[PDB]
């Protein structure tokens, strides 16, 4: 069973090829961790390989666990195809892939539309940059006009799903988090986003920021009465002793906050993306770590 099983919020982890093996024992949501971002399903332009993504859904569904699409609209791992295009071009390409995955996924539990507006627009021309901010009109008069249409898109498309906007290093200042509120204020002048996520890798969460800065931005962040995400958390393991203290240190403030709904791991075996700094919870050959023994109690604990 799940560690979450009998939790009033979900715990889920990323999934893809090395992170399937158990799923299902351990997480109760998923994220696919790459196959649902543009540059994966449309690396040539008007062929749609869905196999990938396919495969996530599939599973979610057999599993009868929510499932985020990741991602609509963000700076990496976008078409190459699509950075040379006018912008008008750009946009119908844009809408194109807003309407496919529509149409393909209806029973999406969360949709993430926009990935790191403060980090990582898609405003670069390098590999899988997208270069398509224009399409989008910019920074426009708000300063965060692509965003607004990117959302718009959003619930024209998906009419009935929840929409979530996603970042990194936010609850580790009052100034990002200020700057990111100011992107859901002027998002919530339509009323276009329903969910706020934030990743928390290990680098947002380091100690020299002490924990009840997260919990004070938290409440920041809830006071807009939108749910809270905690989207792709991952604390390194350089030894298991340094991992079990952060786990203790870090998870709580998270889970236990009244206004996150879920929190995803952001993968839990060897190959997850925070791999070199040994982020996994279960060791190559298969036996869980103490920060994972830790949690799984822990989550049993408070539900
Ligand atoms: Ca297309």
Redesign the pocket.
């Given at each position: 069973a799940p560690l979450a099983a009998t939790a009033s919020k979900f715990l889920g982890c990323a999934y893809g090829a090395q992170q399937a093996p158990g799923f299902a024992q351990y997480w109760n949501k998923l994220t696919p961790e790459n196959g649902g971002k543009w540059g994966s399903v449309?690396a040539v332009?008007?062929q749609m390989d869905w196999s990938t993504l396919d495969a996530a859904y599939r599973f979610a569904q057999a599993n009868q666990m929510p499932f985020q699409m990741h991602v609509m609209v963000w700076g990496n791992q976008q078409p190459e195809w699509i950075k040379t295009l006018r912008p008008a071009e750009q946009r119908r390409?844009i809408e194109?892939?807003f309407a496919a995955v529509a149409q393909r996924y209806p029973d999406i539990a969360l949709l993430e539309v926009v990935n790191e507006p403060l980090n990582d627009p898609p405003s670069k021309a390098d590999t899988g940059g997208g270069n398509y901010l224009q399409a989008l009109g910019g920074n426009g008069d708000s300063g965060w006009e692509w965003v607004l249409q990117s959302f718009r898109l959003a619930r024209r498309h998906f009419p009935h799903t929840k929409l979530m906007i996603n970042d990194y290093s936010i609850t580790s200042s009052a100034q990002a988090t200020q700057k990111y509120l100011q992107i859901v204020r002027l998002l919530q002048r339509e009323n276009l986003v329903d969910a706020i996520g934030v990743q928390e890798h290990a680098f947002e969460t380091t100690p020299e920021v002490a924990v009840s800065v997260h919990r004070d931005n938290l409440d920041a962040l809830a006071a807009t009465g939108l749910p809270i995400y905690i989207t792709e958390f991952d604390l390194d393991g350089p030894t298991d002793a340094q991992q079990l203290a952060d786990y203790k240190r870090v998870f709580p403030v998270f889970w236990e906050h009244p206004a996150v709904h879920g929190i995803t791991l952001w993968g839990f075996r060897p190959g997850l993306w925070r791999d070199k700094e040994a982020a996994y919870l279960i060791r190559a050959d298969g036996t869980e770590r103490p920060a994972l023994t830790w949690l799984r109690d822990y989550v049993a604990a408070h539900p």
């Open positions: 449309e332009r008007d390409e194109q892939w």
